[PDB]
Design a protein around this ligand. Structure first.
Ligand SMILES: Nc1ncnc2c1ncn2[C@@H]1O[C@H](CSCC[C@H](N)C(=O)O)[C@@H](O)[C@H]1O
Ligand SMILES: [Zn+2]
Ligand SMILES: [Zn+2]
Length: 815
DNA sequence: GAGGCCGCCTGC
DNA sequence: GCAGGTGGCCTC
């Protein structure tokens, strides 16, 4: 049968504990690993570590099973090592009758000389702990012993439970109906009387028909959807100052400490006063107004903690305070809602950087963000394209910039070479502490029709070149950025093989999708991010959103092999700061014409928004650089001049007129040869089809093509299968956001919403840089198309900065 | 170079 | 059907 080895060690109620057991041949101990056959006989064997052995008074002999995770059930899937398992926080008590056999598993700890093992290329083994929800591989926790029957998974799942439960800490006074407290804790955050709190926007309230003859293609706007619009963006958090923490005293009288309430003073954002949304235009994004309005909410509703300080009692200035920490707000005046006026507030309101190598550096958007975060000095940068190399050099005088193929340069280092052919010193093992880069996006971009032409192999891709840098140099931290489609390209195989390489090297790693607009730009730009960290390090979290942003642009979850993954991000429906708009981004720039080429002009005025104050910098700038526009042809310029200024205007609003051009001498009038039965006809009975495509799908006749037309011919030609080419020749809206900033803004590109909100022209280089969050002092290089490409390829610095601050926490938390 | 032209997949 | 895709090729 199954008899016990020895006697009992613990006496706990209906369970008699033991230390070791014997099942028919085999002595079994705690710490031993076993196998368990599943109920589904088709499924493979289950594996676990034994952490407890006991006997119940009603049921048979029991044991506690800390489950292992097979690699094939992680995000790796079929690319996993068959013998690799991963620790997880899953466990359960089971009958000893379920144990099939004892199995040996080894722990493959990284070597003490792991950072030098790079470049040199029948038993279960594990090296990493896995999180099934966030696709995180991490070093095994160090939760020591809960002395004998110490399950690792139980210890931290309970520690996670206490961390998440709202608890009061220090009583302050026992009143008639409530018990006042001085402090409370929640999700690891300590709240005390006087602190600031984030609250959901619903926590409390405050005390305050077209003439189809001339515009024929107007019918194609039946969708009534406006790309770039900010009508459905959520409100930012409510902010309040804790006045009381308290619990209902029961009918007996002791406090019910499971039902914690807080009373707060309401803070007004500028846009919450009688001066509505326009009040936000010029104000700092973290300016508040004190108010004497109070509100009671449940402690559970608190979304986080913030600092709200009286402005004039701060020892440093307001800019040094605002730039020196997260979640920092300030106030100067108070708001009297009934008086609708502003009064003075009452009296009762008063690490050394990492040496970084930037591969595919571009002009340096990613490196600039990491520098702003204060974590890195990019001492080496590799960039094959000379104009972008030169841009990087102008902004980073202490950096060694290699205008080199990254493949060639790594081959040189691996062969023992100390310098490149220019005489520049090559980084060696030990020099590189951080490795970051965005490989070209163009092979993964969904707009690329012809990705099926040249690049087919993964072994020969720049992504693998980049991982070879990681393997060779073995940096403390690693970052790879790309377009969102990187996670889904080739049924997610590229994502899975990248993560597979990292764990094979011994790296902790993870991946996620981030929306740049949630970190401080007026732009929808969803980017995939792989983070990795060396074994002795802490793996960074993805940064919590700072700005609210339109929900349709914030779909960040990723399906891989019928398993949905999300990142650690918990701010899903609100955030501390309002959204950044096209107005915030470029309302201060002077008017220029189509084809403006003056490289250095006057600003003609001071910065207007917080965002412009931040990007123009503290030091006075007498000259505005690179506010230059592509010189569009007479036809295209004539098209832009008749795109209405109203929000949502694009090619579909173009009049059907002939127009004399500046230097094209005439633009022809497109007319509807054949009929579209799907779309019908307009008030006049006009055909509504422009080619032989729209009848029965037969073929295009070249006679139906109409050259040099004002309404471009190719857009009605294929609009029915392209959603009416929405956005092409489209204007931005002052209250909206940019669509994705691309390398060459052109009104008939797929991302065609490139027209200025008021001027008859494509957005300038400076405006594109502003949409990416570049400081106005950030140097670009080359002709105007070179400059557009450097900006369009770049990681927005505010996004890179947010990621970098997460890396900073890991630098501080290690030692 | 400048511009016109414009597939296919994902996710809903 | 709708909405989104740091775009590329081909012809002048
Ligand atoms: N084989 C190669 N070696 C080095 N750089 C390369 C390369 N192939 C392409 N590149 C460069 O890689 C870059 C990808 S775009 C990267 C932009 C950068 N992350 C920023 O924030 O500015 C392009 O600038 C391209 O010129
Ligand atoms: Zn357990
Ligand atoms: Zn046709």
């Amino acid at each position: 049968r199954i008899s016990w080895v020895g006697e009992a060690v613990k006496t706990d109620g209906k369970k008699s504990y033991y230390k070791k057991v014997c099942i028919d041949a085999e002595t079994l101990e705690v710490g031993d690993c076993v196998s368990v056959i599943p109920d589904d006989s088709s499924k493979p064997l289950y594996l676990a570590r034994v952490t407890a052995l006991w006997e119940d008074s009603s049921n048979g002999q029991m044991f506690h099973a800390h489950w292992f995770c097979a690699g094939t059930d992680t995000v790796l899937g079929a690319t996993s090592d068959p013998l690799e398992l991963f620790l997880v926080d899953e466990c359960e008590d089971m009958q000893l009758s379920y144990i099939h056999s004892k199995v040996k598993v080894i722990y493959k700890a990284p070597s003490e000389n792991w950072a030098m093992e790079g470049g040199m290329d029948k038993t279960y083994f594990y090296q990493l702990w896995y999180d099934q929800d966030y696709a995180r591989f991490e070093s095994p926790p160090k939760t020591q012993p809960n002395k004998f029957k110490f399950c690792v998974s139980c210890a931290r799942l309970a520690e996670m439970r206490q961390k998440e439960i709202p608890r009061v800490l220090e009583q302050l006074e026992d009143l008639d109906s409530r018990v006042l407290y001085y402090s409370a804790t929640k999700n690891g955050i300590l709240y005390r009387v006087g602190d600031g709190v984030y609250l959901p926007p619903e926590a409390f309230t405050f005390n305050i028909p077209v003439d189809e003859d001339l515009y024929p293609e107007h019918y194609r706007k039946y969708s009534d959807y406006i790309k770039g619009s900010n009508l459905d963006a959520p409100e930012p958090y409510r902010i309040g100052r804790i006045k009381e923490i308290f619990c209902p005293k029961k009918s007996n009288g002791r406090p019910n400490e499971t039902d914690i309430k807080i009373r707060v003073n309401k803070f007004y954002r500028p846009e919450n006063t009688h001066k509505s949304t326009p009040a936000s235009y010029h104000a700092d994004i973290n300016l508040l107004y004190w108010s004497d309005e109070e509100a009671v909410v449940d402690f559970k509703a608190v979304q986080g903690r913030c600092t709200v300080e009286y402005g004039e009692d701060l020892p440093e200035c307001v800019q040094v305070y605002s730039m020196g920490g997260p979640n920092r707000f300030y106030f100067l005046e108070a708001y009297n809602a009934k008086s609708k006026s502003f009064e003075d507030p009452p009296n009762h309101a008063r690490l050394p950087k990492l040496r970084t190598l930037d591969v595919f550096s571009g002009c340096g958007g990613l490196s600039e963000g990491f520098h702003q975060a204060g974590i890195s000095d990019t001492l080496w940068a590799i960039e094959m394209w000379d104009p972008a190399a030169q841009a990087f050099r102008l902004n980073n005088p202490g950096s060694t910039v290699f205008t080199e193929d990254c493949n060639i340069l790594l081959k040189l280092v691996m062969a023992g070479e100390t310098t490149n052919s220019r005489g520049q010193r090559l980084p060696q093992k030990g020099d590189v502490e951080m490795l970051c880069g965005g490989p070209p996006c163009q092979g993964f971009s969904g707009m690329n029709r012809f990705n099926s032409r040249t690049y087919s192999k993964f072994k020969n891709s720049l992504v693998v070149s980049f991982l070879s840098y990681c393997d060779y140099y073995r940096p403390r931290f690693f970052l790879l950025e790309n377009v969102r489609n990187f996670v889904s390209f080739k049924r997610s195989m590229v994502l899975k093989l990248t993560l597979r390489c990292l764990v094979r090297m011994g790296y902790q790693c993870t991946f996620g999708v981030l929306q740049a607009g949630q970190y401080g730009v007026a732009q929808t730009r969803r980017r995939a991010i792989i983070l990795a960290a060396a074994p002795g390090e802490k793996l960074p979290l993805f940064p919590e959103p700072l700005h609210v942003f339109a929900p349709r642009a914030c779909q960040l979850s990723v399906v891989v092999d019928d398993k949905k993954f999300v990142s650690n991000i918990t701010r899903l429906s609100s955030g501390p700061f309002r959204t950044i708009t096209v107005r915030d981004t470029m309302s201060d720039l002077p008017e220029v014409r189509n084809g403006a080429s003056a490289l250095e002009i006057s600003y003609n005025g001071e910065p207007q928004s917080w965002f412009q104050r931040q990007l123009r910098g503290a030091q006075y700038q007498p000259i505005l650089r690179d506010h230059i526009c592509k010189d569009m042809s007479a036809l295209v310029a004539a098209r832009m001049r008749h795109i209405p200024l109203a929000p949502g205007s694009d090619w579909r609003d173009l009049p059907n007129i002939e127009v004399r051009l500046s230097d094209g001498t005439m633009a022809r009038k497109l007319r509807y040869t054949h009929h579209d039965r799907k779309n019908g006809r307009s008030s006049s009975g006009a055909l509504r089809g422009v080619c032989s495509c729209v009848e029965a799908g037969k073929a295009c006749d070249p006679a139906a093509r109409q050259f040099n037309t004002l309404i471009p011919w190719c857009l009605p030609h294929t609009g029915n299968r392209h959603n009416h080419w929405a956005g092409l020749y489209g204007r931005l809206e002052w209250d909206g956001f940019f669509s994705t900033t691309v390398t060459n803004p052109e009104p008939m590109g797929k991302q065609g919403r490139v027209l200025h909100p008021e001027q008859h022209r494509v957005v300038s280089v400076r405006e594109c840089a502003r949409s990416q969050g570049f400081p106005d002092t950030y140097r670009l290089f080359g002709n105007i198309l070179d400059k557009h490409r450097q900006v369009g390829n770049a990681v927005p610095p505010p996004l890179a900065k947010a990621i970098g601050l997460e890396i900073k926490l890991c630098m501080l938390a290690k030692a």
